[PDB]
Each structure stands twice: as C-alpha cells, then as structure tokens.
Write a protein that binds this DNA or RNA. Structure first.
Ligand SMILES: [Mg+2]
Ligand SMILES: [Mg+2]
Ligand SMILES: [Mg+2]
Ligand SMILES: [Mg+2]
Ligand SMILES: [Mg+2]
Ligand SMILES: [Mg+2]
Ligand SMILES: [Mg+2]
Ligand SMILES: [Mg+2]
Ligand SMILES: [Mg+2]
Ligand SMILES: [Mg+2]
Ligand SMILES: [Mg+2]
Ligand SMILES: [Mg+2]
Ligand SMILES: [Mg+2]
Ligand SMILES: [Mg+2]
Ligand SMILES: [Mg+2]
Ligand SMILES: [Mg+2]
Ligand SMILES: [Mg+2]
Ligand SMILES: [Mg+2]
Ligand SMILES: [Mg+2]
Ligand SMILES: [Mg+2]
Ligand SMILES: [Mg+2]
Ligand SMILES: [Mg+2]
Ligand SMILES: [Mg+2]
Ligand SMILES: [Mg+2]
Ligand SMILES: [Mg+2]
Ligand SMILES: [Mg+2]
Ligand SMILES: [Mg+2]
Ligand SMILES: [Mg+2]
Ligand SMILES: [Mg+2]
Ligand SMILES: [Mg+2]
Ligand SMILES: [Mg+2]
Ligand SMILES: [Mg+2]
Ligand SMILES: [Mg+2]
Ligand SMILES: [Mg+2]
Ligand SMILES: [Mg+2]
Ligand SMILES: [Mg+2]
Ligand SMILES: [Mg+2]
Ligand SMILES: [Mg+2]
Ligand SMILES: [Mg+2]
Ligand SMILES: [Mg+2]
Ligand SMILES: [Mg+2]
Ligand SMILES: [Mg+2]
Ligand SMILES: [Mg+2]
Ligand SMILES: [Mg+2]
Lengths: 75, 50, 61
RNA sequence: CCAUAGGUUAAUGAGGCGAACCGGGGGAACUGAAACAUCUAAGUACCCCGAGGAAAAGAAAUCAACCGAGAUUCCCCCAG
RNA sequence: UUUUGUAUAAUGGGUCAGCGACUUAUAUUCUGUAGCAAGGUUAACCGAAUAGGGGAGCCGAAGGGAAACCGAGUCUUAACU
RNA sequence: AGGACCGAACCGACUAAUGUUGAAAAAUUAGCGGAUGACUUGUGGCUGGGGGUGAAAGGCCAAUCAAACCGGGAGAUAGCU
RNA sequence: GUUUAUUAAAAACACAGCACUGUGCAAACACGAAAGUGGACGUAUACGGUGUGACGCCUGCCCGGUGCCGGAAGGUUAAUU
RNA sequence: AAUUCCUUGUCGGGUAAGUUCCGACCUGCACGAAUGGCGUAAUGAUGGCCAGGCUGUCUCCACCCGAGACUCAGUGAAAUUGAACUCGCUGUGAAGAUGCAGUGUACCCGCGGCAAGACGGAAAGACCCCGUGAACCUUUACUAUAGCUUGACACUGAACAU
RNA sequence: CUUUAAUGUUUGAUGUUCUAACGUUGACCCGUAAUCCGGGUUGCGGACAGUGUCUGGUGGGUAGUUUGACUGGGGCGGUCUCCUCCUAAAGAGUAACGGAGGAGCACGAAGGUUGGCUAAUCCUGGUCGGACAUCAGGAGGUUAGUGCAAUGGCAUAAGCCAGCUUGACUGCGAGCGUGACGGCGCGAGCAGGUGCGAAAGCAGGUCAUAGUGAUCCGGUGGUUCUGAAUGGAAGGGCCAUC
C-alpha cells in the first residue's frame, strides 16, 4: 500500500549559459528561488524565471549570500 | 455543500454578475464589492448573491 | 454505396483553406467559476486540428 | 295467429395445383454498438389471405412563395 | 507454425495426383499516366445505339465568421499598428 | 385372506471374471431380488421442445438432452487457432 | 415396491398414518388469448397444494425481520376532470 | 455419532496386540424436536464388526483336462505413420536425447516371448487461466411482461330519501 | 369577508324499491328420434358481476442482459485520479502488490498596496501563579513561522501589525515550457478602466507545487444572429454560467 508517487513536473534549466534566446523564453522552471532573478529576467508566480529581451544568457554569481543570478546579454 | 458558490450582480442597469464562493458559518452578511462592468465600461458596486 | 458521414465529426469540424480543420475547445459548457478568466479567455476562441489527428478526422469524412 | 328459423328440389359461381414479381393481415433473433436494455439488424427472414399479366397507386381538401407548377408509377441529380 | 528461443520429446503432415484461400460493385483519397485547360466533365434519356445530341448536375478558380453579413479580406473587441 | 415365504417361465440387473479394433455401439458365463401384484405383456390410441412426461435422476422423448430432429436467417459473430 | 436404458439400487423417491392450508360448485387449481375440457358426471368424511414419512413417548420458547390472515380512523398516492 | 477440527478424546470389553466395532463419560469447534427428536420386533442383493464350519485367498504353489497362443494350407483386417542405414554411458542443450560432443561396445536377418523407453497410440486438458464467449439455474441484481388485483370511462337504466 | 337555513341549479357520494340492457353450467317448449347451439315462455340475480381501454400495486411464473481491471496462477485481502521525497545512476524522463506520507478543502481576509516589526527554546527577578499564562532583561540567532502532508524557498522577508482598499478587472498576446492528443502552465507588453503610494512603481488572487470531471442532455440570465409563405413567436446558435 506504501508505493505511490506524483507525475514528475519536468523542472530544471531549459536553456543553459551560452545560447542566443528570444524574448519571453522560459529559462528555469524551479520551485523556490534556488535560481534568482536578475538583469532582464522576471520571476514568475511559480518562480519560473522568464526572459524580457533578446540575446544571450549568462549565469552570474553575485550577492552577499552567494546567490545565483541569470541575465540576458546583448552584444 | 460547505462553501457555496454565489454571484455578484451589478447594481447598474446591466445584466452582468461575477462569480465566487462564500461560506455560511463565517459570513451571515451579503457581499458588497466594487468591480468593473463592461457595458458602460466603468466600476459599479455589486451585491445580490444568487 | 456512397460513404456514410460521421455526423459528430461534421458537427464538430469544418474545413479551412489549406486543408486544415477547425474545432472548438472543451471545458466551456459547465463548471466555470472555480476556473480563471485567463483560462476561459484562452478557451473561448476556436483553433486548428493538430498533427496526428488529421487521419482520424479525414477518415470520419 | 300472420310471419321469420328450418326441411326438400333446381340453376349459376367457387374449391385445388402452380417458380418468381404484386397488394395486404401477423412478425422474430443472431449480429452491430467493440458488453447491453433505447436503437439496430428490418417491417429483412418466415407464417397466413387474395388477385393479374402485370399488381398497387392514380386526376389534388398536393406542392411551392406573391413568380408560379399542375394526376399516378420509373430512372438520374439535388445529397450522404 | 508459434515463439525470447527448437534437432527438440511443442503443433501439422502416411504418400501421390486434382481442387483450395486478399476477389467484386459503387463511393473517397493518394501516386503514375493521357487529354483539355480558368476551365474540366457529363449521368439518366433520345439515338442507322461505343458516334452524335443532351451540360439537369458535380468539382475548381475566395475565403472568413456559429450566423446574419462582408470580401483580398474576414472574425473577436467599444477599438487595434 | 395375505403389496405373505422358497423357487421355473416372466420382469429386472446387486457381485466377480472374460470381453474393451469385441459374438455384441452395454453383452456372456456362474452366482442374484420380486414372482396374485403398486406386476408383466400383445395391439391400438393421447400428451410436441422452453413443451410433454417423470413413485424425481435434471432421468426419458428414435444409439443424439441443462431444452430433440429437419429446413431456413446462414457465408450468425469469432480481438481466437 | 421405484430410479439415473449405458461406471450410482441406496440412507435418495413414493407409501399408508400425521398436521397446516386453499376450496360453496359455474368451486379452488391446470391446458387453453376464447370456446370447451380435466377437476368429477364428484360436493367439505370430497378435491388440490405443502411439508413429515408405519408404530410408541413426544414435539417446548420467540412475531424483532420476511411471508400469510383481519380491518377501513388518519397521512401519502395513479389515470380522469 | 452419516454430525468431533485437535482425534487414534478418555476409560472398560474383545484380541498376543483393535485409528475400525460394542458399552459408558461430556469439554456437542458445529445434535435437537415436523427442512422432526428418541427408541424400536420384523424387513434390506443396505454400511460396519466379530465367531463356528469351510476351503488354492495365502506361506507356495504343483499336476492334469479342454479353447487360443506355435507350425502347415485357404481367406485375410486395423488404429498409427515427416523421413530413417532407429546402440549404451557421461555431458551439453527449448532445461530428462536413437540423431549434438566425447567415449565404450557391436558380423547381416528371422522366430517365440517380456514391456523399461521412443515424454508410445485413441479424444485441439474435463480440473487452471484468458475471451469484455455460450448455455441453463437462484434471489429483496436491472429492465420489461403474461397472469392476479384497485379504480375511472363505455357497454348502462327508472323512481324515493339523506 | 368569518360560520349556517327555504327553494331553482349542473351534477358527484351513501342507503331503499322496480326491470328493461347483461348473466344464468334452474325449469319447460320447438328446430329435432340431439346433455352442443339458436329462438320463445318462465324463474333468480340485476345496474352488482363480467368484457374492452387507461391507470396503480404485485409480479424469477417468464424472457433478455450485467456482475470491471492490475495481480508474480485465479478468488478472498489490497489498489485504480491528483501532490511531495527517495528508488532516479549529478539535463528531462524512468517500473514494480518498492520504502514513507497527504488532497476531494479554506479565506472577503488569509487577497492588493503603503508604512512598519522580527521569531523558537533556556536562565534570572517578579502576588495569587503552578514545569509551562501576562511583565522586564540576557544568552542565542532561525532550530520558530510560512492555513495543511512533504520538498524547495523566504531577512529586500513569501513570517507578523495597522490604515486605505477591491487587480480574486475586462479584451488581447510577441513568445516559451510540458504532454501522442484533448489539454495544462509561465508570461514581458498594448487599449480601456480602477485601488495604493508624494514619486520611481506594484497589483490579471493566495510563497509555489494537489484541492478535480471530457462530451452529450437539459436549467437560468443577456443578445448588432436565425426565424420553413410574410410579421411575430416556439426552438436553434453565441456570450455568461448551473
Ligand atoms: Mg495545413
Ligand atoms: Mg456554455
Ligand atoms: Mg456486444
Ligand atoms: Mg388497380
Ligand atoms: Mg396565382
Ligand atoms: Mg500452441
Ligand atoms: Mg516473432
Ligand atoms: Mg540448436
Ligand atoms: Mg525423437
Ligand atoms: Mg515435434
Ligand atoms: Mg500427428
Ligand atoms: Mg500434392
Ligand atoms: Mg456521349
Ligand atoms: Mg411377498
Ligand atoms: Mg423366491
Ligand atoms: Mg436428485
Ligand atoms: Mg443433482
Ligand atoms: Mg437415449
Ligand atoms: Mg437453449
Ligand atoms: Mg441474417
Ligand atoms: Mg456459419
Ligand atoms: Mg448407473
Ligand atoms: Mg448398477
Ligand atoms: Mg421424509
Ligand atoms: Mg416445533
Ligand atoms: Mg456409530
Ligand atoms: Mg480403546
Ligand atoms: Mg438437523
Ligand atoms: Mg426421519
Ligand atoms: Mg427392495
Ligand atoms: Mg543403424
Ligand atoms: Mg541425457
Ligand atoms: Mg502384451
Ligand atoms: Mg501418448
Ligand atoms: Mg485443446
Ligand atoms: Mg477444452
Ligand atoms: Mg434471469
Ligand atoms: Mg439477446
Ligand atoms: Mg483481473
Ligand atoms: Mg546524469
Ligand atoms: Mg534529474
Ligand atoms: Mg513594506
Ligand atoms: Mg436565447
Ligand atoms: Mg412554414
């Protein structure tokens, strides 16, 4: 009777560093803010980190508490 | 039905309601709410559940 | 003996210009108040028939 | 009591057989629906009655749309 | 033959000879090919009967929208760049 | 007098063996119970299948019975072989 | 005594006795859509249904449930109007 | 006990010894009073037990008489059958070998026998499972129905009182 | 308008009498050398019974059907949808009758915004007062909280207080993700029109991940739609919803 599990929700990083992405592309589907919003990135209501402008994707590590930020470059 | 489904009829001359849920054992009073009404396209006070 | 028509498919579908068919979304005859206006606004228009189902619509015609 | 019922005689007509097609009186189930009861299969199969070389139907208390067509039956389209 | 798999001790066959199992009609779609070409094509019928009439009708060139309705635009929306 | 007793024909089939492609699609041999009774038998009528009949076993209804046989629906359906 | 003709003859069936019950005759009950029959050319000491199955001592308790008998106050209640 | 799982319950009998049988006890898993209870003389091709007689049932079989089986002549079948020049042992292997590997043994063929094997022959496992298979049967399973029953309307009226 | 009389009044219900429809498997006569049948006389019932139609109850007497699947053979036992962790081998996903738990709800604030605050536990002192209520200080520094099961996350707080409030508004959607599909989810930004803040700005419900139901059939409200000759209507559609 013990065995049971949900359907897995397909989380994680959809687009990694070093990829030319377009606007509104979902990058990370996560639960908490394990990945933190930053430059050109919105945080969704399920903390889906979603993009705002065309360009690359750069994973910065900034902040006093050593957090993990995502950004969109231009060049 | 413990929490019961009701509506929010506009007090204007418009036949439109929104819809939401209320409880019996917490609210004896009817629900007054200001809300948009897309006939005159303004905000009208709503009442008269069900 | 001409081909009999699947009348349900003829009621739920109609053909577009480039051979696609159109259909109407589900979840729109009853329970709607616990749903979102965003979801119902997505559901309200019509859409096209998807890829793998065209055989199972054209066979119904 | 009259008369009716009834009895005798006599004439005319019928009976019954036959393949199918036709008009009617009765009328299933397997099957399909992926089970099954509404429905289907079908008023099919089958039983019965009656006539003809054909039968039945047939000159509108029918259609249409303000223009009109003009009895019945058959075929092709409308139309899967 | 069915099988993950058979020499298999899983099935079938005593042998020969003859017969025996994806056809038919009307619809739809796709391919190939032939004709004609913004056109193509007739069916039932008439008919010295595959000729020729017959173009009633079907498909195609314009779609969109549930529909009235509009039209290289149409639908939603009070309204779209 | 006796649904009396023993035991032939008559009815039946409890036990063993043979037989089990047999003499026989249920018998033979040697034993076996009833044998004036609710029996046995000849002849001929009656009851027709979702029906009969049955001192009842789901037994018998033409060697075929938890619904006969024959002709039809019929090339019933068969995700099975 | 009867029974599964054909792997079962018995403790299974049936019996006379017992009890419950239906039954007023054009009876109840059964075949039969009806007619007409059987019931029986009988008449509650007769006929059917049901259980137990000679004889002797016997057969106790319960109407909560299900089924049967009695009624006519009340509630509810079809078709009709 | 036709009912008792434990169970061969326990105690007597019988016997050399008796899970059966007989008599008694009760702790009747789970007898019981008309889907009867308890006894019963006789009856039963009924179930169980003991005892005398009796004998090839047995230790332990032996002899004999006839009918087949064997031979001669005549007639002359059958089920089964992929094909066959169809040995054993150990091992491997669709997992138990006449056929594969290795090895041993073996001149070719009849005839009378015996059956251990050829997963022998007969019937597409009856028990098991599956099929969205079937047949019958039961009930307070569902849906309807013949039938039984209630009422209204028609077949259907005349007067009297409430 | 409350409760009741005299009598016209259409008929309904109860009792009594009559006979003429209907019954007679009482008698007598005829067809007729006849236990059927018909007709007549007569007797007894008599608007009862009985037949048809409609309707209610009964109704295995009878017919047609159903009684699921996974399964370490089947049945009994258990389970079937959704969320969370591990098994998941560091992208996603990954089975079992593997190990462990939850959901079929809640809220008019528990939501939006502005301004603001920071908890658990222990020690000390303190009337009833207690191992632990309410006060003050110290250590500590998230062990506490987050509506709930778990995981992730949260100090710029997503935890807690108050004021103002309805953005738990509508019409759209560049694009993305995840499913075979139906679908499900994230979403910057545009037009209108609100709330909060002085402003930059925030708000398309709750910190997120469960809290659910396709289609058909029908209910209610609205309607630049249709309206079987025409004008209407009934119905059908569309939008909202049950
Ligand atoms: Mg296309
Ligand atoms: Mg709707
Ligand atoms: Mg079926
Ligand atoms: Mg004529
Ligand atoms: Mg005129
Ligand atoms: Mg096989
Ligand atoms: Mg294969
Ligand atoms: Mg091999
Ligand atoms: Mg072999
Ligand atoms: Mg083989
Ligand atoms: Mg073979
Ligand atoms: Mg050959
Ligand atoms: Mg021509
Ligand atoms: Mg005697
Ligand atoms: Mg004798
Ligand atoms: Mg029996
Ligand atoms: Mg039996
Ligand atoms: Mg026979
Ligand atoms: Mg049958
Ligand atoms: Mg047929
Ligand atoms: Mg056949
Ligand atoms: Mg026998
Ligand atoms: Mg016998
Ligand atoms: Mg008895
Ligand atoms: Mg008693
Ligand atoms: Mg005994
Ligand atoms: Mg003893
Ligand atoms: Mg008993
Ligand atoms: Mg007895
Ligand atoms: Mg006897
Ligand atoms: Mg050899
Ligand atoms: Mg071996
Ligand atoms: Mg032998
Ligand atoms: Mg064999
Ligand atoms: Mg088989
Ligand atoms: Mg079998
Ligand atoms: Mg049944
Ligand atoms: Mg059937
Ligand atoms: Mg199963
Ligand atoms: Mg990896
Ligand atoms: Mg992973
Ligand atoms: Mg603040
Ligand atoms: Mg409407
Ligand atoms: Mg009209």
């Amino acid at each position: 009777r013990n065995g049971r599990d949900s359907e897995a929700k397909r989380l994680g990083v959809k687009r990694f560093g070093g990829e030319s992405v377009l606007a509104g592309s979902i990058i990370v589907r996560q639960r908490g803010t394990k990945f933190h919003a930053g430059a050109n990135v919105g945080c969704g209501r399920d903390h889906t980190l979603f993009a705002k402008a065309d360009g690359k994707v750069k994973f910065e590590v900034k902040g006093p508490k050593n957090r993990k930020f995502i950004s969109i470059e231009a060049e | 039905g413990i929490r019961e489904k009701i509506k929010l009829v506009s007090s204007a001359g418009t036949g439109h309601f929104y819809t939401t849920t209320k409880n019996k054992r917490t609210k004896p009073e009817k629900l007054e709410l200001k809300k948009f009404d897309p006939v005159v396209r303004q905000h009208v006070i709503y009442k008269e559940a069900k | 003996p001409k081909i009999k028509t699947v009348r349900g498919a003829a009621k739920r579908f109609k053909k577009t210009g480039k051979g696609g068919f159109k259909h109407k979304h589900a979840n729109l005859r009853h329970i709607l108040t616990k749903k979102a206006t965003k979801r119902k606004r997505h559901l309200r228009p019509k859409a096209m028939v998807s890829k793998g189902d065209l055989g199972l619509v054209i066979a119904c015609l």
